[PDB]
Design a protein around this nucleic acid. Structure first.
Ligand code: CA
Ligand code: CA
Ligand code: CA
Ligand code: CA
Ligand code: CA
Ligand code: CA
Ligand code: CA
Ligand code: CA
Ligand code: CA
Ligand code: CA
Length: 112
RNA sequence: GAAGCUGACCAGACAGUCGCCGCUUCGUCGUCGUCCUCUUCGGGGGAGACGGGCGGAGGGGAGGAAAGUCCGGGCUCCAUAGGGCAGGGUGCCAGGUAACGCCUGGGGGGGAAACCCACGACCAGUGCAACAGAGAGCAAACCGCCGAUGGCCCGCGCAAGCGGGAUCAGGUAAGGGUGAAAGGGUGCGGUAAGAGCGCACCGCGCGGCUGGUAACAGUCCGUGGCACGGUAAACUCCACCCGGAGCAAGGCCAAAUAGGGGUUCAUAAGGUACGGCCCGUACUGAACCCGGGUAGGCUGCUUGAGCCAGUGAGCGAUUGCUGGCCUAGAUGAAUGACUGUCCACGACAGAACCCGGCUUAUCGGUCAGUUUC
RNA sequence: UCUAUGGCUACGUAGCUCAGUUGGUUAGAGCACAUCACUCAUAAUGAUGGGGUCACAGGUUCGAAUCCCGUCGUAGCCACCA
């Protein structure tokens, strides 16, 4: 069947800027999420892991894949909105379970 | 034959859901400027080149360094006839890939032979912080003193010159000596007793040789007596190599736009390129900056100067011949969770034009060798 | 507020801006604040603290901020048409 639908990701910088316009922000001192309303009917997610926040590329790939998996899992529940995630300094030392729970809590908060 | 140090490998693997990436293939939607065959187009057997157009089947996806440009190479457009520097690299020499700031045989050095080497030169230019130049360099009270022990009545020759002492001062004393690394010594009539100045030894310098394709060895004869001790990643010299730039090089397919200003121009050929300067080459306006968007599709992107097994060569790096093989290559950018096990309990770390290296991080183990009870 | 992977470019000395180049002295002014007659909570062309590992890891040298290779960090450029 169809693989991952590219219509659920932020590809061009235009969409990134559109989301960064005036989104609703929510996050912990580690990671934050900014969500805006769109007109496609399905939600979208974006990733933003800078090199200064995380130097090791393996950790960047790990966090990106974890966020994508969490989004794919909680896709039918989240509201039709485009989200963008941003990491900070102090997230590489977090474990998989703790980071997954934090992302789940952030998504539950963004649900409103 | 209880414990180190090199060396190749693994460092996470096996099975089950919810998910990413692509390749081949089965059934379909279509374009075809190939049309085989029906081809009067309100169609149809269509064979195939193709496409986020689709529903299934198979086998696969972190590397051991994908981490850093620190090197060389395949390709590419930018663009060049030849002579010279400047600034860059290779440097014990020899062999192999196309080669290298790659690997290996041999020699040499380094106090661990106890296992390393960024190891050419200086008998043309420069320096070498002594604070007494005695680490380019000439001698300082300080002991020495050979030259008459220049002389200086202290004794006498108060009558030819002699004894002593030191005159410590007016003489080079380069011989040990204290002053951060110091012109070779072990011993000698070693002058009136200081220095190869003279005598036996040399790892000190020049030429010859018997080993050896060379690097350099040498306990071998035959002399001249000394004419650098370093740093040469300190200037400089030699044997070879130097246009450089990167796949966000560029090569195609369409899709919305050389239209705009100042830098100066008979045949002086004044501007450009080979250069960063110079002889030379033949070709015509030149870069500072002002105008527009796309974020589209294909390649380089995964078939390598590789892999398996045998026959050879090379005392080794490496390479002649056979049978054969390849399931990631992307584009905000693929690896996750719950369970049964492993003990190798799972550290570092991630691919992106590519290949062969170089530097470093690299929890713990597998073995094949090397020092000590 | 943005942003990897790849090529090239410039550096890392008082908290901030700034120059020095084995010259052996082993190193320098201003901006944050106090002190001398501190003249209106600027004093002026003055001095007194300077609580700088000259970012980290090495090397020929007697010795290195300076010379050669290395690690980390920050900052900048890389899609074309007529
Ligand atoms: Ca396997
Ligand atoms: Ca590789
Ligand atoms: Ca010389
Ligand atoms: Ca000489
Ligand atoms: Ca002597
Ligand atoms: Ca002499
Ligand atoms: Ca271009
Ligand atoms: Ca591609
Ligand atoms: Ca990408
Ligand atoms: Ca990488």
């Amino acid at each position: 069947k169809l693989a991952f639908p590219r219509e659920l990701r932020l590809l061009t910088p235009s969409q990134f800027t559109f989301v960064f316009q005036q989104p609703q922000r929510a996050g912990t001192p580690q990671i934050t999420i900014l969500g805006r309303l769109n007109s496609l009917g399905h939600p979208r997610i974006g990733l933003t892991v800078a090199k200064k926040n995380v130097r090791r590329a393996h950790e960047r790939n790990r966090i990106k894949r974890l966020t994508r998996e969490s989004f794919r899992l909680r896709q039918h529940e989240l509201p039709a909105m485009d989200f963008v995630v941003v990491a900070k300094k102090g997230v590489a030392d977090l474990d998989n379970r703790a980071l997954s729970e934090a992302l789940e809590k952030l998504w539950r908060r963004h649900c409103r």
